[PDB]
Design a protein around this ligand. Structure first.
Ligand SMILES: NC(=O)c1ccc[n+]([C@@H]2O[C@H](COP(=O)([O-])OP(=O)(O)OC[C@H]3O[C@@H](n4cnc5c(N)ncnc54)[C@H](O)[C@@H]3O)[C@@H](O)[C@H]2O)c1
Ligand SMILES: NC(=O)c1ccc[n+]([C@@H]2O[C@H](COP(=O)([O-])OP(=O)(O)OC[C@H]3O[C@@H](n4cnc5c(N)ncnc54)[C@H](O)[C@@H]3O)[C@@H](O)[C@H]2O)c1
Lengths: 374, 374
């Protein structure tokens, strides 16, 4: 029995930037008041986890990364009321406390208890539940899913349907929800519109799914890797373009293709240049552009404000704009009811011990989502 | 009868940047097909007219400036159907052709026939109706209202109520409608919200009027000239702040005052740095910031896209988002029914011949709107 005791288990520790993950034994403390200890079942490999290795995303090291996952509750601390031992759950990298001004607003989701704006790499109480070779290890976004067991605050976990398939619905913990919501909730794509989607990875394919569900008439995928085009068309793209095939900047190409600019554009890569290109390709009087990709730390973009004065709208969002704890269970129920598909995003399935091979697949351009199974 | 004949009259010609206007005789050709010749009655002095003098707003010289005005139709060219000789009219610096994709869109107002994106300083047919000292003189934004007589395209004029007081309703041709619509139509300010307005000139005061009409609970005026505060409070500001009084950046001050950021902010000055400050002071998850001020020609701002990724919305607009020809007559009817006030914007009255004194008053900080009478 493990309840109330320290657990010794395997985890993927990142000791320093620009090194492979180290798969080794860690110690996981029992949950304190208002905390939940979870046995992980499946976790996806997202580009944001890779950003921690490359130095694009800054968060305290050493760390247990991972934020897109699903598992089963092993034990609960004093005072927990929304999950119980044995429940299927998805960790929430954006929390939902329900009591701050953002949680109370009709359209906000970036809860003020988040560990994203100024990352500390701890539990809500400022301490860590992990140790490795006698050294305390940091948490990541309040989730830390690259471990057989994790501990999360109650505001950072949602209970889901007991019959759901965890090796698929882990994607609702990040990539699917982010891209789909960016289209249907943040941009509010309209029927008959023309959309442009920059970046055709797991998140950009989810944006395409949302634009198709909203009734867009045209969905133009943009990527420098033409091997991404076939799957983009399968999930709804009507046409695909590679900027390196053209002797003119792609914003000009897209403006001409759309007879004067697109209705909705999405940056789903993480580059300053493509954020400005995506804004510029939407129609100057009524276009909308949404930033989803995460750019290198502490770098500013340059742009001419006349792009906005004519009438464009520019926005960004975390997690597709969804209030996390309310939305995650509903998205799983919609999946169970066949309202959307997750299989098109999954290209590879590997045991957790093959995490480094899964990161090599992402970096080489060969995969969309690899799902790691514990 | 002057119909079909060249009219010799006085106009304010700008021959060179950074010099006074020259009040001298010009020749005004009769209107061609789908053109309207107007006897001007009153015109306002707007900061955008000053931007032509300072080289902030680039348009070809020599030029007859002026864009905020009202007058009476002298004659109509062949095929005109929307106005007749003797009608009271307001020239429209943003046209409304009714036939392009923008005019047909529910939100759009930046008609594709505009002379703003890349000013050419002509009529729609690419020619000029003005000569001075024997040379052709450019038009400005299709309006050129600093002249006893001007010629405009039919898509750039609206018929208004025959009983309208032209010395007041000329402000509906730019400053009032721009500020009011930026609040009520572009931002869509909500009841009980907190707003911040940067710049307390004629346009910023009109933004305040709109925020108060929309039911905002708090309206914070921001200006480096404290002499602008008394009038801002008269029209609805609840508090006013001068950035020069504070040791901390004003975005930090405003975030503290609003217990975490404002609901709606407006840049109504024309500086790159205040555009970035205004964005930053709105709440990071659900705030909205609207750019109204005109930026220095061809200059780019620098900003961190993490301001948008958390959830902020950034937009701009011309003429308050209003479809010009549909909206101007309705705004005049609302003024006649006392739905809004224009007298608070009018601080000085001068004859047209004293135009240079009117620009001196604006540049010294002493005026809001000076109205010139022909
Ligand atoms: N806002 C959020 O809440 C949120 C959550 C999900 C992920 N993220 C971010 O979303 C982005 C996408 O994540 P993903 O997992 O889909 O990544 P990914 O690496 O699988 O996909 C990115 C795609 O961009 C393409 N690309 C790279 N450089 C390009 C360039 N110069 N021009 C055109 N295409 C280019 C690649 O070929 C690739 O197919 C990442 O930056 C990630 O950090 C954000
Ligand atoms: N978008 C549009 O359609 C549109 C139409 C109307 C006018 N314009 C622009 O709107 C702006 C305002 O026009 P206006 O006629 O009200 O001008 P104005 O000059 O009367 O008002 C601007 C105000 O900004 C204040 N100011 C200047 N620098 C400042 C700083 N660093 N910080 C804080 N306050 C500062 C001044 O003291 C002044 O009271 C101008 O840039 C004009 O060109 C845009």
């Amino acid at each position: 029995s493990t309840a109330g005791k320290v657990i010794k288990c395997k985890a993927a520790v990142l000791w320093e930037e620009k090194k492979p993950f180290s798969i080794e034994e860690v110690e996981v403390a029992p949950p304190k008041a208002h905390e939940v200890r979870i046995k992980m079942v499946a976790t996806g490999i997202c580009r944001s986890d890779d950003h921690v290795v490359s130095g694009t995303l800054v968060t305290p090291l050493p760390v247990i990364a991972g934020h897109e996952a699903a598992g089963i509750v092993e034990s609960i601390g004093e005072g927990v009321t929304t999950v119980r031992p044995g429940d299927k759950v998805i960790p929430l990298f954006t929390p939902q406390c329900g009591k701050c001004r953002v949680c109370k607003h009709p359209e906000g989701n970036f809860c003020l208890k988040n560990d994203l704006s100024m990352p500390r790499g701890t539990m809500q109480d400022g301490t860590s539940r992990f140790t490795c070779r006698g050294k305390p290890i940091h948490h990541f976004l309040g989730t830390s899913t690259f471990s057989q067991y994790t501990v999360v605050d109650e505001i950072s976990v949602a209970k889901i349907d007991a019959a759901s398939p965890l090796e698929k619905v882990c994607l609702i913990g990040c990539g699917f929800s982010t891209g789909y919501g960016s289209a249907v909730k943040v941009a509010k794509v309209t029927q008959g519109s023309t959309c442009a989607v920059f970046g055709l990875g797991g998140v950009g394919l989810s944006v395409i799914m949302g634009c198709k569900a909203a009734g867009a008439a045209r969905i133009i995928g943009v990527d420098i890797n033409k091997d991404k085009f076939a799957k983009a068309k399968e999930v709804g793209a009507t046409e695909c373009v590679n900027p390196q095939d053209y002797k003119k900047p792609i914003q000009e190409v897209l403006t001409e293709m759309s007879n004067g600019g697109v209705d909705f554009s999405f940056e789903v890569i993480g580059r300053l240049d493509t954020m400005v290109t995506a804004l510029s390709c939407c129609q100057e009087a009524y276009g909308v552009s949404v930033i989803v990709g995460v750019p290198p730390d502490s770098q500013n973009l340059s742009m001419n404000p006349m792009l906005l004065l004519s009438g464009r709208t520019w926005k960004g969002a975390i997690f597709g704009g969804f209030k996390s704890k309310d939305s995650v269970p509903k998205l799983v129920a919609d999946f169970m009811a066949k309202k959307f598909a997750l299989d098109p995003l999954i290209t590879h399935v590997l045991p957790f011990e093959k995490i480094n091979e899964g990161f090599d697949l992402l970096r080489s351009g060969e995969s969309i989502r690899t799902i790691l199974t514990f």
